[PDB]
Subunit: 483 residues, 2 copies
């Protein structure tokens, strides 16, 4: 089997490979497998409040981005597999009918980097909301799906310090928009890649083994591994304990930039390379902190020495938004955003005839689901109304009048739904209004001539009134304005 | 090879199958193949006008839908392959790492039908904008991508006749809101599936071979096969010319409902099967035409006898918007939308323990790219501005003033973009403003104290005015409200 498979694979354009691919492509699928493929997604229960809340949050976030002059852009869904970048990060893997291997997008940074490299994009601002996929541990199931939002700035200027402040200011605006996010006391963390490399070199880590150290540090940070396992893993590379001790005394310190100056000052007495790296790192950190202070951002700005986050992809400043949420009597951190400068990805994807400088690029990613859950968990629940007014007809002879009234309402810019059944009882109408979250209803009947009865179900008070038909639109507009 | 392949495939959970799946998923991809995978999408050029126009069109369409009380919903991307529904239509096919066969969504109707069936949704309205994929004829390439919009109504009422009128009225509103679509003189076409089946049965086609006739008729309608080829293909189906001769005279008739009455009533003189179908096929058509007349839709309503469109998926009324645009002195019918009732798709996806009545369901689909192309082609081109005001600093010492001015302007709700460089010449600034379609700029300098020189590039007249800093926001708001 192995020999035959290898021989078939040796010529992907051969007749044997083409015939073999078809045979592993025309197999029948049992109905039980088809039904059970996504038994965890389509459970059966449904709720409209969650969809309305998600729509509102997405609309608010979209509105904030458009204020800065941004535009919406999209990238191709499928990209060829590259094991260099996603060696450890497990992504969904798929193969097509032509024998290729493709991957569902793990993140939107790499596709946009490829887009910029292949499209000769120099200056641009961009926002996008799409889905991301993560394969499931169990077999015969659907990939997990999450919602992600992106905001990228691409500039062709030597000055690359203020866009980093603009991104953080945009995230601060989004935080200020929602009262749910304002009570969590978010904090801002910062770090530099050059400073991290200088610290590693000073601690004695060989320059040829840096990537493995980055990977193990990231894995220990994101997995909460035990101290014993971390010590054993480091000793697996035959690394001395003194290097571990000297590295763990540096990543435990976080605080104000002026407070951590004595710690950073000790690194300026090292060799030429260490001093040269720390100079640039300190310069950029100081400048960014100063410009953030000039913008009057109330959120605390802290410099984190041990902040490792996709360090293989960023060349410069990296930041995160960390808030301590008291969940189950435990201060569990939750990340709302992250990003940094990633101009190093452009040289990989350029074509044979690409001439010109490499422009700067700064991006950020937000977790919409966290915002939605935080807003929905608030005790002072936010109520979203699908339609302002609901038109109900009583009797079969009043259907045309209700249809004409509803059509007139739409022409005036008022959102209104029209019920379809004319034999609905009053109790059924009240139950429907309560379930569908509707507070204003207009009853059209032929027993009152050219008058309609507007009913309101507000809190524990039930108010009804008679409104002239010619002034129903004006009455609704006045009520909406006064609301 | 075939015997070994069959033996391996006979046990999908066997060790040999897993080993083959691992081996076929660990191939090496050459850089030349990787670079050329999507060489047809990333053509190397870019334009911001197209993205802005598409964003505007999508925002307008989304705004129209929300006026009716609609909500946004999404469905899982990957669904198991089903050759029963997509036997003829070509769809992109992929296989995951476990050998299971999955398909990229060809359309959004079937995933939403599955969603409704598994979630037992009774009443709901929904809109969604996503992408659809079509595989390419050439080998080693990326699938094609198109943009589609959806609008579905699910009702549990027995007297469900008016939702079709509501859908057609919504599309009429969308047509009205764009001056580009108003000048194309669109038309509305209607038909019924019961009437088509009754016509086929009256023509003498056997009742056990109807699906093949539906498919060949759809193929002839879409691909526009030659008359000789259609006649030859019909003979190959073991069908005599007796059914074909009397079938080409019943699908050439188009006109008003009252004008085509002489043709339709001649089919009510038959057995108890033809008349029973024609009664239902005429009642709903008459009722829908009456309701459309009551709503004052200016678009002419015509009933099409030969309108075949996914007849396998609709049980009831189907409609389609057709406009005879002029392209190279040839009338090419461009379809804007189509849809119909599809309540028959629900029982397929229901579970064996699912119990309850099957509710009605009416949906539609719109081609956004056609709207964007139509609008962008207009001679009186619509100008979209990314930002109202552009803040430009002169000299290195005025950067802080420009930054705080832009922050204050953002605080007041005005969308403004701040330039990053300071040594930019006047000619470069003018070129940048012209390229990005920006009309208002604010030059900040310390040579004029607290005064900001506001420049305008309105047409051929250039206006320079001195504006106090404290009244810049008021000036911008006044200018925006003036026009």
């Amino acid at each position: 089997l192995h020999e035959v498979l290898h021989h078939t694979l040796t010529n992907v354009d051969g007749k044997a490979y083409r015939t073999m691919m078809a045979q592993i492509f025309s197999q029948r699928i049992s109905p039980a497998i088809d039904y059970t493929y996504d038994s965890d997604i389509l459970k059966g229960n449904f709720s409209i409040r969650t969809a309305k809340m998600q729509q509102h949050v997405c609309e608010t976030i979209i509105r904030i981005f458009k204020r800065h002059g941004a535009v919406q852009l999209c990238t191709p869904l499928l990209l060829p597999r590259n094991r260099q970048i996603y060696e450890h990060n497990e992504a969904a893997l798929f193969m097509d009918h032509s024998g290729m291997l493709v991957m569902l997008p793990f993140d939107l940074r790499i596709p946009f980097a490829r887009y910029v490299a292949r499209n000769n994009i120099l200056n641009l601002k961009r926002y996008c909301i799409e889905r991301v996929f993560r394969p499931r541990k169990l077999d015969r199931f659907h990939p997990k799906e999450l919602l992600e939002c992106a905001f990228d700035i691409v500039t062709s200027t030597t000055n690359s310090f203020l866009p980093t402040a603009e991104i953080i200011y945009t995230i601060y605006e989004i935080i200020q928009e929602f009262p749910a996010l304002q009570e969590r006391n978010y904090s801002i963390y910062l770090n530099h890649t050059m400073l991290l490399k200088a610290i590693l070199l000073h601690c004695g880590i060989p320059e040829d083994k840096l990537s493995q150290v980055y990977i193990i540090l990231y894995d220990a940070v994101t997995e909460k591994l035990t101290r014993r396992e971390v010590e054993a893993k480091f000793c697996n590379l035959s690394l001395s304990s003194n290097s571990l001790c000297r590295l763990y005394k540096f990543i435990e310190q976080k605080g104000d930039l002026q407070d951590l100056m004595p710690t950073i000052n000790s690194l300026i007495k090292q060799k030429t390379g260490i001093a040269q790296l720390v100079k640039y790192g300190l310069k950029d950190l100081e400048e960014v902190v100063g410009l953030l202070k000039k913008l009057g951002i109330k959120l605390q700005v802290l410099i984190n020495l041990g902040l490792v986050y996709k360090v293989q992809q960023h060349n410069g400043i990296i930041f995160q938004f960390v808030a301590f949420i008291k969940r189950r009597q435990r201060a569990v951190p939750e990340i709302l955003a992250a990003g940094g400068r990633y101009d190093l990805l452009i040289p990989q994807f350029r074509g044979p005839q690409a001439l010109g400088p490499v422009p700067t690029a700064i991006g950020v990613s937000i977790a919409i689901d966290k915002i939605s859950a935080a807003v929905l968990n608030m005790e002072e629940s936010v109520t979203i109304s699908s339609c302002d007014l609901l038109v109900v007809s009583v009797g079969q002879m009043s259907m045309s009048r209700a249809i004409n009234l509803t059509q007139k309402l739409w022409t005036a810019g008022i959102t209104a739904e029209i019920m379809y059944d004319w034999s609905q009882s009053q109790e059924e109408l009240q139950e429907y209004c309560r379930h569908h979250e509707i507070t204003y209803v207009a009853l059209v009947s032929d027993k009152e001539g050219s008058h309609v009865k507007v009913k309101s179900f507000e809190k524990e008070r039930q108010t009804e009134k008679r409104v002239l038909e010619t002034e129903l639109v004006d009455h609704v507009l006045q009520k909406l304005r006064t609301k």
